[PDB]
Design a protein around this ligand. Sequence first.
Ligand SMILES: CCCCCCCCCCCCC(=O)O[C@@H](COC(=O)CCC)COP(=O)(O)O[C@H]1[C@H](O)[C@@H](O)[C@@H](O)[C@@H](O)[C@@H]1O
Ligand SMILES: CCCCCCCCCCCCC(=O)O[C@@H](COC(=O)CCC)COP(=O)(O)O[C@H]1[C@H](O)[C@@H](O)[C@@H](O)[C@@H](O)[C@@H]1O
Ligand SMILES: CCCCCCCCCCCCCCCC(=O)O[C@H](COC(=O)CCCCCC)COP(=O)(O)OCCN
Ligand SMILES: CCCCCCCCCCCCCCCC(=O)O[C@H](COC(=O)CCCCCC)COP(=O)(O)OCCN
Lengths: 67, 80, 79, 545, 80
Amino acid sequence: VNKIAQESKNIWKLQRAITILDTEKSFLKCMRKAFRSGKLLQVGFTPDGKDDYRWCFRVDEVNWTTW
Amino acid sequence: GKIGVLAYILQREIHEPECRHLSRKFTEWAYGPVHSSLYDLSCIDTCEKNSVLEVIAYSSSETPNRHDMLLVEPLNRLLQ
Amino acid sequence: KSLFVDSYSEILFFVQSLFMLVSVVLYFSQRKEYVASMVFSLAMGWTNMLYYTRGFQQMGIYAVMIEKMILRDLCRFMF
Amino acid sequence: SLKQFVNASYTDSYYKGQTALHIAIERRNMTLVTLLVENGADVQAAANGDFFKKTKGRPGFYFGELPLSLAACTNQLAIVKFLLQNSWQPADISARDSVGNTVLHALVEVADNTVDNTKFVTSMYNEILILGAKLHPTLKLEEITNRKGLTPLALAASSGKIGVLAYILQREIHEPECRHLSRKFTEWAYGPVHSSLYDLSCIDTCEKNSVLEVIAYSSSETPNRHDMLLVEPLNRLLQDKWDRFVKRIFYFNFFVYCLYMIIFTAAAYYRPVEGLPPYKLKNTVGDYFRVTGEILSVSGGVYFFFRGIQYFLQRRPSLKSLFVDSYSEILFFVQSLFMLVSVVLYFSQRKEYVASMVFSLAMGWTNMLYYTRGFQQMGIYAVMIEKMILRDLCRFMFVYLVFLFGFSTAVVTLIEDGKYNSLYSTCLELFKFTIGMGDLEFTENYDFKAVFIILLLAYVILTYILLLNMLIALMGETVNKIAQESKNIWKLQRAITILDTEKSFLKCMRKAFRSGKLLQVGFTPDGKDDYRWCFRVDEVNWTTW
Amino acid sequence: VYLVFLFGFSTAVVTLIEDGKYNSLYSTCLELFKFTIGMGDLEFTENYDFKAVFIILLLAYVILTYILLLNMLIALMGET
Ligand SMILES: CCCCCCCCCCCCC(=O)O[C@@H](COC(=O)CCC)COP(=O)(O)O[C@H]1[C@H](O)[C@@H](O)[C@@H](O)[C@@H](O)[C@@H]1O
Ligand SMILES: CCCCCCCCCCCCC(=O)O[C@@H](COC(=O)CCC)COP(=O)(O)O[C@H]1[C@H](O)[C@@H](O)[C@@H](O)[C@@H](O)[C@@H]1O
Ligand SMILES: CCCCCCCCCCCCCCCC(=O)O[C@H](COC(=O)CCCCCC)COP(=O)(O)OCCN
Ligand SMILES: CCCCCCCCCCCCCCCC(=O)O[C@H](COC(=O)CCCCCC)COP(=O)(O)OCCN
């Protein structure tokens, strides 16, 4: 028990991930709302003149260095 | 199970003209200490065949770092 | 090989169902031995409740620790 | 005209009030700030849109809504100085935002107890205090309260900003015309010895938000509530209060409760066995003692009942904090409830009062462990017992009770037309395995003996061999990780007892106010002399002669 | 701590017991002590009413001393 703390947490998170994937793969209702994170414009300038929307996921961060 | 390369790719940010589009992590806004990042999520959440989440989760148990790979930032936050 | 060293929960739920179906077959075969099958399913049915300790972090990690104790320490001890 | 142009600001409800000065400061552009101030920018424009509020469920950044507070909270000292002491439009250092937070309240709010953040927040706090002294010597910034009535110190204590609190309480400013801003002073120093003095204003006592009351009666969601009492003056001060005043009263309370529990035990032990209560009082010595004991027991029950209600009404826990914290109040209250229900059943002519009474009696004795606080080693031990119950016993009991019930149902299903043949009897019979009394052949009223023995061996291997030994292992892991946490929790418990005894005090005594009123500097900004009720701490240092 | 718990539950049990063989602090104290050494009877008497109350008390004692306190003692010795 002293040596499997982090290993146990990681295995639990993998078990929960498997549960999440199985739930979304079953879904029993043809629901599209399972597709999360929203479709945002990243650069708007690909190599050509087109704009790129890429379904990004937002993560807010705080840092008190590198102003 | 190449966790180093996976960690590199998923949060790749390329700061130069005509190579920004190769990034997978972007900064949308930053006010003061606060700043909001955007992770690409193409071929992570869903794709044709080999989603990163499906490939990790359904790995064959001989993969070296299969338990550790979900700690790579966007994947853990996305699963939560 | 991944069928046994991995996915214990799938095996356990499947084996519970196998005990149930063998119980049904014995029941309509006019054998009292269906009871022997049924109770095994019943016992397994309750221990499989631990599958749902995932979804709660503390109990989930606790259940993983139980699994690892079984597979390592209890096995060596029992030999 | 230019004043309307330069002071143009957003009107939408999200970025409301933001103007070019806010953007100039946010961008760390000194030139733009200077230019905007030159042209009549309003240095008091309040940015009060939803983006500039706490708003835990949305992104944002609270900084106190003012340009001075923005400059301070972004670690830009030069802009802070410029805004405070420019020629065209100096900023109002005492200004308050819509919440009532001044610049110092804002600096406390942006604290988050990381090392770099704590460093810059305390540095900016000190610089702002120095500047306020130089610009407004008669102004006492730290006494300004926000709309909740909290000063920056009380806000730091209630919010769990341990870094800022630790800075404030032992703040020492070595320069002329800013000495009075100190809260730690060095009185005399002979050799390596020197005797420092801590302020104790608004720590030991004040109108509303004493630091000790704020920390001790915190709402259990505060991040560092166990840790904040380790800040130097507070730990020494609580030890002083204990030793001088509270130890004797607490021992007296423990003695009285012990007498009450002895009397209750004696009265309950000699209860009469005739049917149909209440019982006629016999004209003999023993029965007079018995009924006196009954009255005293019920009196104590009513006592604890009303003290529990008083606790609830005074604190008003929000129905989740009511249960996850203050276990001792709940336990003593439940004891009193069992006593009162026993009284009702006694005078309702029901024998069930015995069932109530014994429960109270049992709880009463376990509640004696409440008094293990006030003794160091037993207090730590009781805290560890609490944490073992709350973590490891609870998780084990969930898993164990699932296994017990599952195998009990399997076994009782296999059994047919026997003595046991009931869920209760088989549950108890499998429970006996846990206490090392399992029969393993307790019945034969089945068919398929091999199934019965396989079930029992599986149950024993899963619960007795695996789960109990695993519980011992997990408790061993836990006790290794809660040493310091146990010390801090016990210190908080004793602090709670100290504050409760001082608030009760039963004699209108003023000696509870410790530390003595010393002339600290004798030179405030004006010619008056400052007496501060300081607390003396002697220290010895063999460096820095 | 153990002796506080032992005496408290002993007095509760002997109060609940009425006109029996045990019906005394000494006998009931010893009979609850037998739980500590793995010999607790757990139905050692019936000379009461409210068997639910009796068994609730004994299970509370068993949980608090046998399952909690002794195992906690082993953990503490490991720490020491
Ligand atoms: C008659 C009565 C018989 C009952 C006997 C059994 C009692 C316990 C029953 C508890 C039921 C819990 C459960 O359902 O199984 C537990 C483990 O149970 C055992 O250890 C049985 C040992 C034999 C976890 O199962 P899981 O599939 O999640 O395993 C993880 C994978 O997910 C993941 O991908 C990784 O590969 C990881 O390495 C895997 O571990
Ligand atoms: C039939 C028989 C039933 C008897 C059941 C009960 C047995 C225990 C008997 C032991 C008596 C000890 C006691 O009287 O209570 C103990 C807690 O016992 C339990 O945990 C019972 C769990 C359920 C201390 O309670 P305390 O008020 O100090 O709580 C702390 C706060 O004060 C502090 O501010 C902090 O917020 C901290 O987080 C809190 O923990
Ligand atoms: C870790 C602690 C474990 C506790 C184990 C139980 C012992 C604690 C009992 C203390 C409670 C009060 C004892 C009162 C003594 C008493 O008055 O009981 C006397 C017996 O005297 C003695 O054996 C002295 C016992 C010596 C005490 C050694 C610590 C006779 O009552 P009997 O029912 O036995 O005789 C009835 C015959 N018809
Ligand atoms: C740590 C877990 C250990 C488990 C210990 C065993 C108790 C678990 C029992 C749960 C199963 C459900 C019991 C159903 C109650 C019931 O209906 O049975 C009642 C008895 O009720 C009770 O004593 C309540 C017990 C108090 C509940 C304390 C948790 C009377 O049936 P008898 O066989 O005794 O009498 C028949 C004589 N002709």
